[PDB]
Design an enzyme around this catalytic site. Structure first.
Site, mmCIF file in Angstrom:
data_model
loop_
_atom_site.group_PDB
_atom_site.id
_atom_site.type_symbol
_atom_site.label_atom_id
_atom_site.label_comp_id
_atom_site.label_asym_id
_atom_site.label_seq_id
_atom_site.Cartn_x
_atom_site.Cartn_y
_atom_site.Cartn_z
ATOM 1 C CG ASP A 230 -4.300 -0.888 -2.188
ATOM 2 O OD1 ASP A 230 -5.067 -0.263 -2.957
ATOM 3 O OD2 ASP A 230 -4.657 -1.262 -1.050
ATOM 4 N N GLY B 115 -11.081 -2.657 8.880
ATOM 5 C CA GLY B 115 -10.944 -3.096 10.259
ATOM 6 C C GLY B 115 -12.055 -2.852 11.263
ATOM 7 C CE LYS C 8 -4.407 -1.402 1.926
ATOM 8 N NZ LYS C 8 -4.946 -2.527 2.706
#
Lengths: 184, 285, 281, 185, 281, 185
Positions: free
Chosen positions: B108, B159, B87
């Site tokens: 990402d 999350g 990421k």
């Protein structure tokens, strides 16, 4: 004539769409009992480690092997080759008499496309798209070599199995797919 | 016996868009260590995402979330043979350049990390390595693609163990696609203005009957059932970060996720892989 | 012997008719399932933690573990129900395959879909859904619900919302009963309910499926009241096991729903019941 | 005219009461013991057998229900009723119908099915049988007459002034099995 | 010969199918009725004063005089329609008894009921109602309407509202066509339409009755456009008789609705038509 | 395979086109003269006769339609079609069917009715006849064959390769009268 596309994981659509262009009927093979419902099977691109895991967890591997040895026509692209290979320098089906090297060209940034000559399907070169492709470092006794790129076999044929290290399904060239149906 | 050896081309659209097609029907897992990478790989993951701390911890902790340490990423790259993604903060060109040079397989540009640019994103065309971006609807999915994204992931709440946002957005995107499919050019141009998406890509969506790149569900998947649902809603696969390693038996949970995405339309199998999975993360709500 | 049909509307709607005049209890263990069954419960609801704990705890409330549900299924012979998050098709598919007798797409669990519900017609097993008025009770039914439960505030020990809504539904039904077609079509727009079902309510003089009271019942008197307000039965979760003597309380609930119009009996079963949950207000 | 009672401690009491009203007879929902002496016939409805027996005992109605029946009171039982009357069950019960029953014999609710069954005694037209988590009659006694069966199993029996079936006629619009009962009064 | 049935849904809905591909003209006299009929109109609408005059004049617009309607009924052999104030049951009863072929509960007349419409099921004669979207088109149908007309602004010579609404309806239909049941029930609540009719639209891929464009059509091109947008035909009131040469204009309208996809023909019938009404904007 | 045309100047063209598609034949909506030479059969649908004839003349299709028919082109007419083909009407017309018709013979739209009629030629099961502001055939000619009648009136006639009825079979799900027409091709 009904051709199956193993669909536990991978670019199943790309292949199914190619077969439909060739007018044949298709069936996505997810369960063992479906292996006995097809004249041909395509092992698509995707993740070999994923395919073998699912294949075992669903008790399809041993039956896939048998079915193939009984002469079932199979076409494998990239991941398929690694799946069929007898030697890998990782669990596998071990039926194609060849030795393969995974991620032989490097990481994804190394992925490349080049024109390759496959005499068996015409004079016009074929557009070969190698994505994190494997290399065939050793071919067996009955393994016929249908095309190569830079000293390496990129398209082999042993019995009713046709395996290549690139992705014809990502192109609009149906030639390698016809050649497979011709094997049925 | 040399065989063929004509000119080759790298990092082209067909190769980037293509690479992602290989992920369809799979699960991409967030991993923090080489040990997790191995569990993920053994479970049947199609790729792993290298991180210092998973989304749930990113929330709990706080501070500025940046690119992982090169050390951590090499650790994971060397631990498995499946593709490794990393990421980067939105708009952080430098981080991406570094990552490309490192050889990561997929960058990402995610929003789970402290954004670097507040208005613009990275011009992904300049790169050879493919990028994956988030979207909450057809409009931004399409914009992200116009910038070069080779793969889109319909995001939810990272999350939290709650698929609600993921469902919301996956339904949203699919709904719009369906509609666009039956619009007349003059309606397409108008719609483009409305949802702020490039008309050229809308005309493309209208013909393909789907997004012009692979679309994954992401954010909040915490149980096999969740993964199957995402597929029922039209996803090409799912990204699972916190939901696996934040549970009691990760290896157990992981194998189930992989199987739920494959057998999402098989109740017998969904029930089998659900018989036992351990305790899913508690989640935040 | 001849052709058989399964999972049809008559069977789903019908199964629920068998529950009328009874009490459905939330149970967390095989031990509770047995207490519930011995008490005279008509069915049990499998959960990991009752509504009151769902509140106290927090986090994302999902489907119970298959293990927990099998535990309860094997512990009693009465039907076993399991809750699923709203809009969570997958959870429901899993549950149907598991053989649960009635799925409850409830709102006491963290909703999975924020706009749509599960298209219950696709299933063979019956579903029960919540409603706060005739409008959503009717919508839920249009989606396939075979049984409606007029909800209140889960795990608070306060029947107030349950009363409010039960009265609301009953009031509207009564009204609809005396509306002319043109008024029906208009009302449908107002309360956002399908006119076809309104015409149905108008003839039956009641909902087209069983309607249970739920949420906040914590004492025999509460259960009796719900029946006085027109319920077909009650769902009791926290109110029984969150009290001092559950087995004692449980037998009383069962008897209150049956003898809600018998003061002598209501007083008898109230003479001693233990200490009802404290409740939240 | 006659007054038929519907035991109403728990169950689909309305469905039955409505059937009887279609047949024009007067009805009474029986909740208290003293009401058992106010009816010419009694219907034990569908519902939960375990619930019915519990309430029945806690209200001291069971022993009196048994007596009353043995003294020839006409009874009609559907599903739960059968299990309630049965003498043997493969659980508490009234134990007056000389048969052996197996509970939830077809499986869970998802197994519930509806099929047409032939009940000669009520006409040539088959009857719509709706079995919901139905029980199976695995053994019939000496005086137990079998009025209809489905797949090798008795689904409608008659012993004395008792009429018991394992399905739910009250869920259909077929009043035939209900007339046949009144004919027993 | 055997048992016959009258005024059934198949007959009402059916009668209107016969109008497809045609033009219905508003007429004020027996002379106009004849021009309309000679022009190829499929039916005429009896009025005391056309929509444009209804605006100009003012006051309370009611049902036409029986005399005026008989005049027109006796003047032509094609069906004769008459308008009634919304919700005015009495006017409709009178009209049905008079033998009118189609009642139009229209909004161009001073509404009689402010909330409810006429319960059209009670009647034997078919009704046609207005709608601005799928929601009310569907509601109107639930009340019994056998034909819907997507309205615009009566007597203004401006097709803009007609276009807006025709596009709106068609758009929604298209969408509904691809919705899943759970989405259908939800959509029903949103646009306030009966879910049963939505499921019907979803299968037919169109409204369950004939849908005509209406309001503002003043030139052949306008009529053709309406068809291009998906109408089954058009209603023209002011646009024909409020122009210089009505008979001329009328024949053109009829041909535009038929040859809306033929530019050669559209141009031919447009070469000369006179001066369209000025219009209000 | 054969291609059947549906005259589409005005009328319930869809209803017919959909019937033909159920019978699997290919269809063509006929609006221009040049299209009359592209079909094996033609259906004159329901609608407004006065409208049809007007458009037909204004587009110079009438004279050619007549010729084409006399040269044996198979035609099927429902309600309006009959009035269009009729030789005598108690109004302009094509004048080829040797019959005399009376328009709006049953009264206004409120008089429209549906009844079952017996059409032997297509089966024993009666046909659902829906007469909407239907016309009456008050006189049939020499070669006009009568295939079915209702209350003393011919409601389905056949003269040569023309099949005409005064009701609307296309509004029902009975494809029988449509097959019988294709059988004429």
């Amino acid at each position: 004539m009904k051709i199956g596309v193993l669909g536990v994981q991978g670019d199943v659509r790309e292949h199914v769409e190619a077969l439909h262009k060739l007018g044949v009927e298709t069936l996505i093979v997810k369960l063992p009992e479906q292996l006995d419902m097809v004249d041909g099977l395509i092992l698509p691109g995707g993740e070999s480690t994923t395919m073998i895991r699912i294949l075992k967890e669903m008790d399809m591997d041993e039956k896939l092997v048998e079915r193939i040895n009984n002469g079932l026509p199979v076409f494998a692209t990239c991941a398929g080759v690694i799946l069929l290979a007898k030697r890998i320098k990782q669990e596998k089906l071990g039926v194609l008499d060849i030795t393969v090297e995974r991620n032989a060209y490097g990481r994804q940034v190394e992925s490349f496309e080049t024109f390759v000559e496959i005499p068996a399907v015409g004079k016009d070169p074929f557009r070969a798209i190698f994505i994190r492709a494997p290399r065939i470092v050793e071919t067996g006794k009955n393994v016929e070599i249908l095309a190569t790129y830079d000293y390496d076999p990129v398209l082999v044929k042993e019995g009713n199995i046709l395996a290549c290290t690139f992705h014809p399904e990502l192109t609009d060239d149906l030639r390698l797919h016809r050649y497979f149906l011709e094997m049925v | 016996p040399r065989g063929s050896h004509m000119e080759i081309k790298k990092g082209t659209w067909i190769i980037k868009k293509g690479f992602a097609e290989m992920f369809k029907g799979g699960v991409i897992m967030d991993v923090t260590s080489a040990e997790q990478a191995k569990i993920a790989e053994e479970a049947g993951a199609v790729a792993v995402m290298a991180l210092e701390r998973v989304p749930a911890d990113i929330r709990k902790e706080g501070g500025v979330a940046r690119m992982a340490s090169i050390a951590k990423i090499r650790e994971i790259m060397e631990a498995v043979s499946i593709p490794v993604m990393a990421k980067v903060r939105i708009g952080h060109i430098a981080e991406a350049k570094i990552l490309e040079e490192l050889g990561v397989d997929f960058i990402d540009e995610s929003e789970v990390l402290t954004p670097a640019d507040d208005r613009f994103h990275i011009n992904k065309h300049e790169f050879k390595v493919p990028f994956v971006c988030g979207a909450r609807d057809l409009g931004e999915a399409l914009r992200r693609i116009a910038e070069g994204a080779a793969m889109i992931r319909t995001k939810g709440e990272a999350g939290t163990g709650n698929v609600v946002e993921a469902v919301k957005h996956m339904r949203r995107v699919m709904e719009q696609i369906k509609q666009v499919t039956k619009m007349e050019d003059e309606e397409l141009v108008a719609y483009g203005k409305e949802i702020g998406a490039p008309v050229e890509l809308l005309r493309e969506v209208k013909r393909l009957g789907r997004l012009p790149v692979v679309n994954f569900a992401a954010g909040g998947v915490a149980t096999p059932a969740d993964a199957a649902l995402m597929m029922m809603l039209g996803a090409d696969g799912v990204f699972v970060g916190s939901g696996i390693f934040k549970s009691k038996d990760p290896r157990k949970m992981a194998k189930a996720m992989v199987l739920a995405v494959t057998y999402w339309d098989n109740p017998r199998i969904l029930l089998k892989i659900s018989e036992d999975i351990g305790e899913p993360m508690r989640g935040l709500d």
